[PDB]
Amino acid sequence: ASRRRAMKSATDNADDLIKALTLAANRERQAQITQEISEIVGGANAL
Amino acid sequence: ADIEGAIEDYVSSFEEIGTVIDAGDGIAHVEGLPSVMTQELLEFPGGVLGVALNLDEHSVGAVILGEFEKIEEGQQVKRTGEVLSVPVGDAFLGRVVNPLGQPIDGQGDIAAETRRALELQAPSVVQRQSVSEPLQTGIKAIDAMTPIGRGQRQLIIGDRKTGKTAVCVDTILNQREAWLTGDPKQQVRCVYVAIGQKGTTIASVKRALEEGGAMEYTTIVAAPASDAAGFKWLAPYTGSAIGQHWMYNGKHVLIVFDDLSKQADAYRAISLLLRRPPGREAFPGDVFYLHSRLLERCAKLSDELGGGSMTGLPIIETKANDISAFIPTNVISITDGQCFLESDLFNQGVRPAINVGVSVSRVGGAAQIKAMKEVAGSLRLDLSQYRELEAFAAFASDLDAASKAQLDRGARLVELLKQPQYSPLAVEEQVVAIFLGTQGHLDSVPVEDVQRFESELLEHVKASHSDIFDGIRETKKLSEEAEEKLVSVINEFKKGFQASDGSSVV
Amino acid sequence: TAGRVVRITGPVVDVEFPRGSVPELFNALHAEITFGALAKTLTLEVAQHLGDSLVRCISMQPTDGLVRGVEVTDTGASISVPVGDGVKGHVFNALGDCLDDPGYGKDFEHWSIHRKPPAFSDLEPRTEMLETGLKVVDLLTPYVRGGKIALFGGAGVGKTVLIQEMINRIARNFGGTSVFAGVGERTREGNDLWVELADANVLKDTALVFGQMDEPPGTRMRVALSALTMAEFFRDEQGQDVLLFIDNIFRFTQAGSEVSTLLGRMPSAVGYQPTLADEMGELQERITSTRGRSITSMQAVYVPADDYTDPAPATTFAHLDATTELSRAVFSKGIFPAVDPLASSSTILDPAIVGDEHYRVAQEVIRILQRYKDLQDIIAILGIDELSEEDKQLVNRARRIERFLSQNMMAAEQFTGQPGSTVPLKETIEAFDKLTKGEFDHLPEQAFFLIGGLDDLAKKAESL
Amino acid sequence: PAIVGDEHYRVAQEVIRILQRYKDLQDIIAILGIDELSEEDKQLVNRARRIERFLSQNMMAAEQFTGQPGSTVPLKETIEAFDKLTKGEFDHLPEQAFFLIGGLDDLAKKAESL
Ligand SMILES: Nc1ncnc2c1ncn2[C@@H]1O[C@H](COP(=O)(O)OP(=O)(O)OP(=O)(O)O)[C@@H](O)[C@H]1O
């Protein structure tokens, strides 16, 4: 019974950690896109 | 030799008309207008207005405010003679106006007292005064846990559909009792600024304020999602100017910016269209200034300047409740506290979804009335520890007597802070309600009925024992005699209260 | 002779002069705004020479209402601020105009806010610990008397409350002068600090130079130099010990970034000005203490989006003898002052300076907290119950150490109501030596929360 | 399989399969522990560690990285050794015996030295 409870808690924590890491990875994905575009258009504006 | 004189003569020589030479997606360049001021308001032939941002040697680059579709090359642009400014006055109460002060509610024109510039400096350090009197929001959670004082900047931050407008509309509605007093030192005037919100949501808000009798002291500055970036960029500033005209006259204003993340988006659009190199998340470096400039004018003026105040409830719409993003962090570092509304709590029926933990009020406490601070002093820590203990106990094999008592008290406190929309509570009713819970009088009531037991109980007090409410309202303190009378009334009511479970709540 | 305003781009104004009278860099120019409520004497600061006798300038007040062609007269000297003993006890803006007494300080000695840093031969390192009474600061991040201290932290983590706490702990009993420089913090906070210092009677010994957020970027970036010039006068001329509280120096860099965008300079990594390191060095190297005369400086550094890799904090990290990095994670657990014990550091946490006992206790605490951090990912999924029994014990005493680094700060009374407490350094070392050795790992964790000492620890333990 | 032969291809693909399964399991092992894996997966992990270490080799150009001289392993011997590993004939030897050896004879010598 304690293993059931502990593994349910572990699964819930893993799901919450997956959600947090997915939100993060989305933030760095958007930030990488932005930064790449900033570099590209900074080179463009100077040339 | 004579060239310098001759050239100088020319500069000297300068109802003057310029002509548009470029135009596109909000920005129009106007050659001529040698005597235009920076931030001057230029009127184009179709009644469209623009702000002269850049003043080059040659033409002037202006951000068009409104229908930029009607701006075309060769059109005549003529000065208004007024730096970026909007009409102000009491004629704006009960009206819906666009960021330029032009009415859009279909009623008549507004009789402005004067014109106020949108970019006047905020009160200096010596011109302000410590926030010392409360702005009752009518929300038990906010007025008990993170109280707002007049002159404070409180940030309503949360995700979509987390209940943020409501927490602002309820705050505006709760000022009707103060308005009916007729005392300028008590009346709180409201300016609800809608930036990029759906037109139907502005209509809803106006309907709610009308059915609550709140429009007779509220002004709505509407910049719906259909309007260009210029309107969504000015709307907070015109709202703050309407409010400032009252603030400097001794009146107390409540400004709601709904939502400042859309002003930031509009300013980002304008900046990128001006080809200004962006920074973090594509926002310009001025994006902080944009908001710091705006919320710094919400202040509690010193008694030398009439003692007026402007309270700001800026709204920020976080994405995936990421309170560490750029604009949210900027506004948190600008404002005096945040009411963080979580979508997790709000989806599970806890509405207002005030996350007690992250939510805080820096400037409050000094503003909270004595009775509320006495009854609600321990509420915040109790609720936070209850959330943590409920997270712990969800998987623990057993709960001690003290732990179970804490859990039972916290569940009833949460159910007590739960409150229906467009149903703000007077401060005395909130005092009694939080008294019911913090003093354990709810421990004998089943959780599911806490909302009803409370809701009915206040009615009884309004109907048969108003002396308690009158005392709390007048002396701003819950006296021990009134406390004993309230306890007696609570016990008397619990005898006749019919619980849903059937069991007596005595 | 005077010039003309040729281009206006927000708070940046281009002004053209006759070929023989182009002003030098950092000169102060005066223009006139004559429209209605915006009428003022606009103060510009020359930033670039664009050629053809044009000079690009940064406006100190908002340019709103300025017109092309208005006369601009150069003063021949840079923005000068009043300096002297009479400066103490008053509130100024970036331009030296007093706010409480509008005409005050017009006859004092005036000093340019632009000056070279002290020559390298005048600099010597400082290594004297400054006992604040905060457990975390005194143990893991010992502040340096005459050194440069910083309080990093995202939005709403307690930087300003720590600045107030260190004013209450250092400036309150300080024998010398103090200077507080708002550099883009709330005007409400400036007024609160003014009234608090007046109430504590510390105002008479401190000079305030605010230039807060509503100000344009020009003043928002020159206010730090103005306050630092007042402090430099108190240092070099009057021979006093000086406290220089700066709240917050990221707002100086941010104003610089805004100006750079307006000045036309190409953006750096993440939009900041290319001169970010140069400007920050110019500001910070002046805040150094010279050989025989000390200037203790404490600086709040806002970290945008809680990104401690942002170029501005990353640049300012190299200028500090002690750094206290406030963390959102520690804040969210209720552990005020919210210091990150692992990221914060000081240059004097060296056994030769703080002693072998202090160093040993600090390093053992850091080891325990680092091991706890390394286990954090497993603790997130499975909890302490899955760890080994040498790590389980370590994690328990790490949680107790983490909660014991918290303190009931004296500035936190306004929020909590609980009065503040001060822990002497020896008692802190003893308490943490005991905690790391496991002499308190049987008490509940909450017994260590916001307690401040061993006597209070025993008292609270009982209460629980 | 048409160029290197069916034996070489099979051994290479089995090694890659074992290593990919080990890479997938490394996340589990670091948190839930090896003891919670399946018996087959546990045996596979023990196989994969030895295979990773056996892919290491003391190259001649790296004498100044390790001190010991370089070694050359014929292709036939490599295929035979990895077929034995992937099939299990060396699960009894310690994994450190497979580190920087280069060949079956060196494997035996280093195992005896352990
Ligand atoms: N206290 C409450 N109790 C019950 N329902 C509520 C409460 N507050 C809000 N709601 C409902 O929740 C929904 C979302 O409310 P609201 O529009 O006020 O949130 P919001 O933050 O404005 O969302 P958005 O601005 O993203 O549209 C609405 O249907 C509203 O009626």
Ligand SMILES: Nc1ncnc2c1ncn2[C@@H]1O[C@H](COP(=O)(O)OP(=O)(O)OP(=O)(O)O)[C@@H](O)[C@H]1O
């Ligand atoms: N020691 C403390 N005890 C209790 N509450 C605290 C403490 N420190 C901070 N807080 C809470 O956190 C808030 C943050 O305070 P502070 O003004 O110092 O923030 P900050 O991180 O410096 O933010 P900003 O970016 O606006 O300068 C305080 O107003 C109070 O609400």
Ligand SMILES: [Mg+2]
């Ligand atoms: Mg809404």
Ligand SMILES: [Mg+2]
């Ligand atoms: Mg602060």
